[PDB]
Design a protein around this ligand. Structure first.
Ligand code: CL
Lengths: 8, 216
């Protein structure tokens, strides 16, 4: 998938 | 001869092989595991078959604070320069292959990005970008293998839903496919996720993780 996760 | 000579598999692309590594994003790298479930490379140069050459499972771990695992099932094709050339527009004109289509400039740039081709004879408008000569070795006898993988299903935590390009999870979307390159000398795999609506160059890196098990 394309990763859309915010910085964490 | 009229046949490809190799089951119709590769040492580093065969049923049961597992890979581990990561996919990059701008903020961090994410753990990835891949399992190859089926491999059915073509028998004939002038093949009529449209069945996927590879299928497998793709897992990305610890994607967000609240999403510990995303597991997908993918299908894919292995570039052979004949029925399946480097440029998708010259694949068989069949609707089942629509998810692998891209602009010829997109295919050319992504394959060249892996860095393994020579510098001679590049042509944007040729079906293999000028990179396949009849004195070239057949695809399985070259060091580097090129593949495209398209995720089609979302699985549960025990390996549920059919994917589509317009619905997604919080943290992962599914509109594109991977360009993939396998080094047959080392087993190392690299890849890039691509869709025109997504940022470019999220990068996959993988190495085989269960060769000892397969060899014992
Ligand atoms: Cl065949």
């Amino acid at each position: 998938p394309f990763i859309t996760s915010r910085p964490w | 001869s009229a046949k490809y000579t190799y089951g119709r598999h590769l040492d580093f692309l065969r049923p049961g092989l597992r890979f581990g590594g990561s996919q990059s994003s701008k903020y961090t790298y994410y753990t990835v595991e891949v399992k190859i479930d089926t491999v059915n490379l073509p028998l004939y140069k002038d093949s009529r078959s449209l069945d996927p050459h590879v299928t497998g499972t793709f897992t990305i771990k610890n994607l967000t604070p609240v999403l510990d695992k995303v597991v997908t099932l993918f299908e894919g094709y292995v570039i052979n320069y004949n029925q399946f050339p480097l440029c998708s527009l010259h694949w068989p004109a069949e609707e089942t292959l629509d998810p692998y289509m891209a602009q010829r400039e997109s295919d050319c740039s992504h394959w060249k990005r892996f860095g393994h081709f020579g510098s001679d004879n590049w042509s944007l408008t040729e079906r293999n970008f000028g990179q396949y000569n009849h004195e070239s070795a057949e695809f399985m006898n070259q060091r580097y293998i090129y593949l495209k993988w398209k995720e089609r299903f979302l699985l549960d935590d025990e390996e549920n839903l059919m994917l589509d390009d317009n619905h997604h999870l919080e943290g992962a979307s599914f509109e594109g496919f991977y360009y993939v390159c396998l080094d047959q000398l080392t087993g190392s795999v690299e890849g890039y996720y691509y869709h025109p609506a997504c940022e470019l160059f999220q990068k996959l890196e993988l190495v085989p993780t269960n060769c000892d098990a397969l060899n014992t």
